[model samples]
Target: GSSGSSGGTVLVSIKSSLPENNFFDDALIDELLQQFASFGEVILIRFVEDKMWVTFLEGSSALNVLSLNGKELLNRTITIALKSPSGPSSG
Candidate 1:
């Protein structure tokens, strides 16, 4: 028998108007996590420059966050998209 996993990651990008440094404060990060947690179980969160990678225990949660795309947070628009596994081979 075979089985499949339903968990996945979502790519979240904060649009322009973000400061170069000290933008991701602890309080803001917690709030962001709380927001995502509302959709599902957030297993891990990775921040890359101005982008954030949020991992959820359920794929449905990943899909649900897309609704937040183009939504404003802290006076800046955020873009959310489902992370694709089929990308460049480079690690």
Candidate 2:
């Protein structure tokens, strides 16, 4: 069906005690890959507007990471939520 174009992208929110920290870096990305790779491979990512976007290649594995809906990463409590399905191709 072409109706549910989920895109496999999840919006992530990171809350750290230190507000002046840059959450965008290689180390954190590496850690994210390391943690998320177990479920599937990451296809796309973006850090903007105080939020993170992670897109997985396998829609099936998307659920695995989606399960981390309100989980934390590093010293920050983060939430992973699905982006509204765009009516086109997925990332």
Candidate 3:
């Protein structure tokens, strides 16, 4: 049998809305990415309004991110979950 590849994407739900003005210019997004990069190599990061997706190069790193569920970011509570390979849907 062939072995499966490790690593997956993580879904992050930000409770607070990101600043509309200078949103990308702000450090919030970078800071968020930095937090995940601490665990492992971050291959991709996608943000949709308040929702964010982070892909790790190692499965263990993804699990590490899940452990951060219900953590605080920018004084706002954020929820984290491992995303299915098929991808996340509207919720």
By summed lDDT, the worst window of 10 consecutive residues in model 2 runs over 1-10
lDDT of 1 by residue, 1-91 (tens): 1123356777777666437743465655676777777677688888877677888877777777666777677755667777665644455
Structure candidate 3, residue pairs in collision: none
How many Å off is the CA of 76 in candidate 3? Answer: 1.7
Best candidate, lDDT-wise?
Answer: 2
Instruction: List candidate 2 segments past 4 Å from native.
Output: 1-3, 85-91
Report the Cα lDDT for candidate 3: 0.67
- Badly placed stretches (over 4 Å) of model 1 are 1-6, 18-23, 87-91
Each candidate: what lDDT?
0.68, 0.71, 0.67
Ranking by lDDT: 2, 1, 3
Report the Cα RMSD per candidate.
5.5, 4.4, 6.4
Residue 73 deviation, candidate 2, in Å? 2.4
For model 1, the local distance difference test gives 0.68
Clashes of 3: 0
| Of candidates 2 and 1, the better by lDDT | 2
What residue pairs clash in candidate 2, if any at all?
Answer: none
